[PDB]
Enzyme design. Structure first.
Site, PDB file in Angstrom:
ATOM      1  N   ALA A   1      12.975   6.812 -39.094  1.00  0.00           N
ATOM      2  CA  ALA A   1      14.114   7.475 -38.477  1.00  0.00           C
ATOM      3  C   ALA A   1      13.847   8.942 -38.174  1.00  0.00           C
ATOM      4  CB  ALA A   1      15.345   7.351 -39.375  1.00  0.00           C
TER       5      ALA A   1
ATOM      6  N   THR B   1      15.482   8.856 -43.207  1.00  0.00           N
ATOM      7  CA  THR B   1      15.404   7.434 -43.511  1.00  0.00           C
ATOM      8  C   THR B   1      15.305   7.196 -45.008  1.00  0.00           C
ATOM      9  OG1 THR B   1      14.304   5.373 -42.906  1.00  0.00           O
ATOM     10  CG2 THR B   1      12.913   7.246 -43.455  1.00  0.00           C
TER      11      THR B   1
ATOM     12  N   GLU C   1      24.595   4.598 -72.552  1.00  0.00           N
ATOM     13  CA  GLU C   1      25.263   5.513 -73.468  1.00  0.00           C
ATOM     14  C   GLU C   1      25.382   6.915 -72.886  1.00  0.00           C
ATOM     15  OE1 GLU C   1      23.364   5.379 -77.268  1.00  0.00           O
ATOM     16  OE2 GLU C   1      24.356   3.525 -77.881  1.00  0.00           O
TER      17      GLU C   1
END
Ligand SMILES: Nc1nc2c(ncn2[C@@H]2O[C@H](COP(=O)(O)CP(=O)(O)OP(=O)(O)O)[C@@H](O)[C@H]2O)c(=O)[nH]1
Ligand SMILES: Nc1nc2c(ncn2[C@@H]2O[C@H](COP(=O)(O)OP(=O)(O)OP(=O)(O)O)[C@@H](O)[C@H]2O)c(=O)[nH]1
Ligand SMILES: [Mg+2]
Ligand SMILES: [Mg+2]
Lengths: 428, 426
Positions: free
Chosen positions: A90, A136, A245
């Protein structure tokens, strides 16, 4: 039975992943083929006659970095199907890498995670490495996290997102795609372990005094921090703190989850001969403005909570004095509501650092997090970068040309503006 | 994947082509036959981007050649690496169109586009996926190049998604063989601003000075003149052909250096550039490779960058290095030279790296820049175009087999309207 999976994305995750699994393959004592001449269950899978394969998935629409893996020395253990390669990247463009070309690939990658999630007994969550500036590597995650959120909403999707520095912004438009994702980060994920690339240059040039670092030396560092988080669920410990946790006790509000990272000791081999690396030393080597790797000023801010993941030969008694020591400090501060913000995870196993790396074979190590208000000053720079040109509306005609309307830009910044104000609200 | 096709419109492009494919083929370790002979197994992993795998373990380029004159085609296939071509892609014509731009772009070339569009329609569809239609055309002077403006205006009808690069050789008054360079160069820009998404405005004026000052050569021969123009764009594409710690394609350079689609012109730059004796006395580090590019002399564009401030730039480094040296130097240059860069674009600079530097050099580089300074060139051509146009001269070559007089005003107006946009940012 304790399980989690890695989702490497963009140019960042792969360059990290070739060096992140450089560690795990040496933690457990397995060749880079897959064979192991339990701990490995969380990230490997015992298959065949002694061949353990990682629970990874690599997606860079650039077919190059994966071809370096598919041709590299780790060509064997990585499953060729989850080594997605794409066709054409991209080009550091969010809206392009989100839906225009990303949709061609999400149909495939969501099958392997569903293959592994169905193959894994029970997950504490996911972990997704990526960078904002990749486009991208960033806009694909904007589309990937919502698919994984709808597919897996109960699971925790943490991310070690790289973040551009105010000075060294290697791209030109990465002031755009960063804030575009953070609008999407808070919606889906639950803790974004932000990291800056310019800070590590200041980490390594001074503490382990390397004259010129490569991303290899940078990546070999951010492997230790991730392994140190996940050693609890992956190894034995006096006080195990698995993935579920610390995210619960670190994050006060459902939106305020952006803890900056930190690791110690970060020192060369020649220098490690000198310090004994006591717990009061390395714990105090975590809170100074230098060793933090996000390029912010913690002294101006205030910690909410923290989580220390000790390793190696460590006993609570000396950190029990340490956690008392910093509460005496006034330069270091804490928000009024949290009286004590120090989780203390131990693992009797040492780091077992990578070879051919700058770090040293220390018998003790520390990670550290903090959901501070100091992180707000980080994007206060980038929000200024984004705001000054979007008023000028430069570099936007590409995003418009790819489909994303102009409205999303105003909606992403105002969310970060509204997100910023919470840090002053929570602070007092 | 990310294929790229390469065209030669004019006598410039072919001598550029014969060297474009003499660094690249030798950068892949290739003989004049076509068969790979390199020792590194890495340089074939994306040989496909230019070449097409043929029989006999032989790779060959998608080199389209057009001149409207066989005298130039004869130079190519006879020269070194003249067999490394597709004779179907060699294309001919009757006359060279008389340095007109009215014969080629309308009449004598339009009777040939169907013979060169079909082969790229063929050879673009032949491959998997592609990035662009790059070429090497003299924007002024030779009119087989200005004919290429027809070749670029029609691909936009075919492949508007892709990006057409133009390694364009500008004209210049200090070095102007052709007399009608303002006529064909000024009018061709009317199309490239609307069609092209990138353009590298090489210019022969400065390009001699780089060959005199930096290299200290008694005489620039065209053979020794384009070894640096073959390398200035090999360094643009090496980021595709080879693996980078930070990667880039022709589209990344576009989106990260084009604030607005019409302001997509550029000035390239290559480093290191050294003589023989003056090579051992340089540090061979990023600062040594940094100042070698940003300096005004090492700029193929015939302009003075000290006047106009860089909107955006890019630095496609090569050879294994450290990114800090590549980061801090690009970062230091942005601060001290705060005037030569823009305020409202923070961190103008890009970077890009490879692990396979060119042969003979352990490290290399390349520079790109979109700047306000290009207005000086466009003023330089339009200041004399209007002189040649006011009190019209040579227009019946442009009225016959050509266009109306209003075509000049629309192009000159939109071409002068363009220069105002650069003036807006200084
Ligand atoms: N960079 C280079 N530029 C060149 C070279 N030879 C010529 N030129 C430039 O090209 C211009 C002259 O046009 P051409 O070389 O394309 C001769 P051509 O056959 O294309 O004329 P037409 O038939 O009129 O198209 C002129 O401005 C020269 O500076 C070369 O080897 N390299
Ligand atoms: N922390 C870290 N950052 C990296 C590494 N490699 C690249 N980056 C950073 O990633 C940021 C954005 O660029 P990239 O993500 O590399 O670009 P990309 O993913 O190739 O983008 P596409 O071309 O669309 O794939 C840059 O600012 C780099 O500094 C790495 O190994 N570690
Ligand atoms: Mg990439
Ligand atoms: Mg001719």
């Amino acid at each position: 039975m304790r399980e989690c999976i890695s989702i490497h994305v963009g140019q960042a995750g792969v360059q990290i992943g070739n060096a992140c699994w450089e560690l795990y393959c040496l933690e457990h004592g397995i060749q880079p083929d897959g064979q192991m001449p339990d701990s490995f269950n969380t990230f490997f899978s015992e298959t065949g006659a002694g061949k353990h394969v990682p629970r990874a998935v690599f997606v860079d629409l650039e077919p190059t970095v994966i071809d370096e893996v598919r041709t590299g020395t780790y060509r064997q253990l990585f499953h060729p199907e989850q080594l997605i390669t794409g066709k054409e990247d991209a080009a550091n463009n969010y809206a392009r890498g989100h839906y225009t070309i990303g949709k061609e690939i999400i149909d495939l990658v969501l099958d392997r995670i569903r293959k592994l999630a169905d193959q894994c007994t029970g997950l504490q969550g996911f972990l997704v490495f990526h960078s904002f500036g990749g486009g991208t590597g960033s806009g694909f995650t904007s589309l990937l996290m919502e698919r994984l959120s709808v597919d897996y909403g109960k699971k925790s999707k943490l991310e070690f997102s790289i973040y551009p520095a105010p000075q060294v912004s290697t791209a030109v438009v990465e002031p755009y795609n960063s804030i575009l994702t953070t609008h999407t980060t808070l919606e889906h994920s639950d803790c974004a372990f932000m990291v800056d690339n310019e800070a590590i240059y200041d980490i390594c040039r001074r503490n382990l005094d390397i004259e010129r670092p490569t991303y290899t030396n940078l990546n070999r560092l951010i492997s230790q921090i991730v392994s140190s988080i996940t050693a609890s669920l992956r190894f034995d410990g006096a006080l195990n703190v698995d993935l579920t946790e610390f995210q619960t006790n670190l994050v006060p509000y459902p939106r305020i989850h952006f803890p900056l990272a930190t690791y110690a000791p970060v020192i060369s081999a020649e220098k490690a001969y000198h310090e004994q690396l006591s717990v009061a030393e390395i714990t105090n080597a975590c809170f100074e403005p230098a060793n933090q790797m996000v390029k912010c000023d913690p002294r101006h801010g205030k910690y909410m909570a923290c989580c220390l993941l000790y390793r190696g030969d460590v006993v609570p008694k000396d950190v029990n004095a340490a956690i008392a020591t910093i509460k005496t400090k006034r330069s270091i501060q804490f928000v009024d509501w949290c009286p004590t913000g120090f989780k203390v995870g131990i693992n009797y196993q040492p780091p077992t650092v990578v070879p051919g790396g700058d770090l040293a074979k220390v018998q003790r190590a520390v990670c550290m997090l903090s959901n501070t208000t100091a992180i707000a000053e980080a994007w206060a720079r980038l929000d200024h970068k984004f705001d000054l040109m979007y008023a000028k509306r430069a570099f936007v005609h590409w995003y418009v040309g790819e489909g994303m309307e102009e409205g999303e830009f105003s909606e992403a910044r105002e969310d970060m503006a509204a997100l910023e104000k919470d840090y002053e609200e929570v602070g007092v | 994947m990310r294929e790229i096709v390469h065209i030669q419109a004019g006598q410039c492009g072919n001598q550029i082509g014969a060297k474009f494919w003499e660094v690249i083929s030798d950068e892949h370790g290739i003989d004049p036959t076509g068969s790979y002979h390199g020792d590194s197994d890495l340089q074939l992993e994306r040989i496909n981007v230019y070449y097409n795998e043929a029989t006999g373990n032989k790779y060959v380029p998608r080199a389209i050649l057009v001149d409207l004159e066989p005298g130039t085609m004869d130079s190519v296939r006879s020269g070194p690496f003249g067999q490394i071509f597709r004779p179907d892609n060699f294309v001919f014509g009757q006359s060279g169109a008389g340095n007109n731009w009215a014969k080629g772009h309308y009449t004598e070339g339009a009777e040939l586009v169907d013979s060169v569009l079909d082969v790229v329609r063929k050879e673009s569809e032949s491959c998997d996926c592609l990035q662009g239609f790059q070429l090497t055309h003299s924007l002024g002077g030779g009119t087989g190049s200005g004919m290429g403006t027809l070749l670029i205006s029609k691909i936009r009808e075919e492949y508007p998604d892709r990006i057409m690069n133009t390694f364009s050789v500008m004209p210049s008054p200090k070095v102007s063989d052709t007399v009608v360079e303002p006529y064909n160069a000024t009018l061709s820009v009317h199309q490239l601003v609307e069609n092209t998404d990138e353009t590298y405005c090489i210019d022969n004026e400065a390009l001699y000075d780089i060959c005199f000052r930096t290299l200290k050569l008694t005489t620039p021969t065209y053979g020794d003149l384009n070894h640096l123009v073959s390398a200035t764009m090999s360094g643009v594409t090496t980021c595709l052909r080879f693996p980078g710690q930070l990667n880039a394609d022709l589209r990344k350079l576009a989106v990260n250096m084009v604030p607005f689609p019409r302001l997509h012109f550029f000035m390239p730059g290559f480093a290191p550039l050294t003589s023989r004796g003056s090579q051992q006395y340089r540090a061979l580090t990023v600062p040594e490779l940094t100042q070698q590019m940003f300096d005004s002399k090492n700029m193929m564009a015939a302009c003075d960058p000290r006047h106009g401030r860089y909107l955006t730039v890019a630095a496609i480094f090569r050879g294994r290095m450290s990114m800090k040296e590549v980061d801090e130097q690009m970062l230091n240059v942005q601060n001290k030279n705060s005037s030569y860069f823009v305020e409202w674009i923070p961190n103008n600079v890009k970077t890009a790296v490879c692990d396979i530097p060119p042969r003979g050099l352990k490290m290399s580089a390349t520079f790109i820049g979109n700047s306000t300074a290009i207005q000086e060139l466009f003023k330089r051509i339009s200041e004399q175009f209007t002189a040649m146009f006011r009190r019209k001269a040579f227009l019946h070559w442009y009225t016959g087999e050509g266009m109306d007089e209003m075509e000049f005003t629309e192009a000159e107006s939109n071409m002068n309207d363009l220069v105002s946009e650069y003036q807006q940012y200084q």
